């Protein structure tokens, strides 16, 4: 019938009627074609069909299924927060809003863990692992469809006589359900926010370090090689070759960056390991001379090791440092998405309903609105995610501009 003064000022203020439709318009122009093309690439241009592509396809799908409703969302705010399209259509927008909110987090957790898991403990069932990833996506989609039930089924529109407007979502029509609303958004903020954030952050912890460990093995290989050429005694040559061998065997076990989604049984992957077999064999040739007593002769074999390193190794292990940089930028991209889109929203969602439950009004109402607005930016940050993960997306991204 009549809301609190603080809410009524916000619902008539420029923050909702000017700032919001502008930001939302930007998101519409930016996010719709970007995710539109990304979804197209993952379906009709990606011939790898790896579990990472599948997660990113649903991520783009979650983005699209929300941004398409933005023209009605923009029009709503421009006309002073007044909904004239019906209660059912309001609950649609509300549904797909919270759906993309939570699908994004869950699909980010899947993608981040999956990509980190292919580095720590890689497997070789690209076809089976894909089918699994599809099933997981269906499971996620249905679990969210079920969890967003108390948002679809409840009256989300109210006519405010003093404001002469019909608000959608922004005003709770039944102030008696605040108790239920509080617990609900507190459950999600823990189980669908913090818990996936914990799994997301630690995934990059293991991913980055391992990509710095591949850098360590390449570094140790180049460091010990320089020691042999400068060494004088037999003990300095014998130990440096044993250390260079251990680093070479560990680097062979790891997956190269040029051939990412290429299975460990593929002929391209065999070429990378072939260069290592010539390299390891040459360390064995040097050790044989070192064990017999020939120091200056061990030393001459290291010069042959530089020839194999510049022809086969500095072609595949050539761009492993570029792969490390992509993972970092990805970790930055994700962190910004959490810092801007996820954390301000979930935190305030609890805060907002907590105050309405305790006092009947919340002074964080303006922050709650700004938070919900900035949360939609995730679909604008999502294309940067596809750029650092998908190799096929980069081609279509670069060719377009």
């Amino acid at each position: 019938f009549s809301v609190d003064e603080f809410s009524a000022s916000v619902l008539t203020g420029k923050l909702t009627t000017v700032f919001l439709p502008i930001v939302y318009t930007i998101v519409f122009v930016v996010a719709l074609p970007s995710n539109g093309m990304a979804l197209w690439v993952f379906l009709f241009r990606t011939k790898k069909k790896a579990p990472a592509v599948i997660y990113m396809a649903n991520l783009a799908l979650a983005d699209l299924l929300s941004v398409i409703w933005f023209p009605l969302k923009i029009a709503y705010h421009i006309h002073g927060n007044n909904w004239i399209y019906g209660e059912a259509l309001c609950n649609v927008l509300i549904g797909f809003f919270y759906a993309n909110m939570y699908c994004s987090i869950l699909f980010l957790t899947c993608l981040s863990v999956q990509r980190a898991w292919e580095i720590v403990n890689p497997m070789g069932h690209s076809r089976k692992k894909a089918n699994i990833a599809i099933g997981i996506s269906l499971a996620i989609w249905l679990l969210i469809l079920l969890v967003t039930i108390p948002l679809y089924v409840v009256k989300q529109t109210i006519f405010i006589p003093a404001l002469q407007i019909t608000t959608c979502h922004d005003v709770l029509p039944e102030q008696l359900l605040v108790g239920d609303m509080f617990n609900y958004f507190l459950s999600l903020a823990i189980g669908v926010f913090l818990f996936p954030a914990f799994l997301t952050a630690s995934a990059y912890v293991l991913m980055i370090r391992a990509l710095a460990d591949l850098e360590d093995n390449w570094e140790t290989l180049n460091d010990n090689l320089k020691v042999i050429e400068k060494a004088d005694n037999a003990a300095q040559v014998k130990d440096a070759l044993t250390k260079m061998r251990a680093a070479a065997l560990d680097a062979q076990k790891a997956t190269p960056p040029k051939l990412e989604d290429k299975s460990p049984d593929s002929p391209e992957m065999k070429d990378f390991r072939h260069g290592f077999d010539i390299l390891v064999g040459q360390i064995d040739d040097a050790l044989k001379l070192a064990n017999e007593g020939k120091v200056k002769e061990a030393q001459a074999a290291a010069e042959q090791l530089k020839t194999t390193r510049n022809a086969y190794i500095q072609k595949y292990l050539e761009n492993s440092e570029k792969k490390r940089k992509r993972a970092i930028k990805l970790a930055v991209t994700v962190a910004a998405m959490y810092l801007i889109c996820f954390t301000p929203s979930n935190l305030l969602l609890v805060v907002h309903y907590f105050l309405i439950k305790s006092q009947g009004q919340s002074h964080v109402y303006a922050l709650y609105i700004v938070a919900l607005c900035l949360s939609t930016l995730n679909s604008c940050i999502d294309p940067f995610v596809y750029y650092f993960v998908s190799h096929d997306f980069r081609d279509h991204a670069k060719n377009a501009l």
Partner: antibody
Amino acid sequence: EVILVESGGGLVKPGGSLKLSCAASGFTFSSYAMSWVRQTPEKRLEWVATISGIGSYTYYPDSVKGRFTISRDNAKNTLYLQMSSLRSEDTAMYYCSRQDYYGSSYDYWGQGTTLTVSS
Amino acid sequence: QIVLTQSPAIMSASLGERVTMTCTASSSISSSYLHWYQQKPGSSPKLWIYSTSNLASGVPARFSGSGSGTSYSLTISSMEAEDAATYYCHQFHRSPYTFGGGTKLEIKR
């Protein structure tokens, strides 16, 4: 900090018209909603009218509606409450109150004005 | 139109007692809509406990309101002489915004 004073009342002939002035100080009048609450001789409180801070947005209960007209003045910082066709049931202490929020209700009250509707 | 009944309408309590006074409603009201008011004879009824639990500015710690849904109550840990006043419960859930009966608190001698 915030203080309110009511002016008017007195002996009124039944079936007439009267104005009640509520003075405000210490806050921004337009930034807060205002309301009038009456108290019968049996010390029983009853809601009369509440006006929104944005503009002329009036609402009265069925028993009050059609007679009372709550007037607002932001530039003069004084709240009004005009009556028409007065009854002997209107004999009550009329209090002025500042409604901050719906969940906060009337945080600041006035002092009261004696109204004795009798011929 | 929710009817607010205050039980008891009049009660005597000696200083230092755990004073409790209830406010019953006809239909279900949110815990965010029931507010308490203290009224001393001659003076205006000033805000005491807003939205069943939260206390207003200058209100002593001895007051701690509890209750939600249909059952609502004002609780005083230590009874004092200045507490002797009429207490009213107010709702803003549905128009008309009805007030309570009034629990007249008096000193037991």
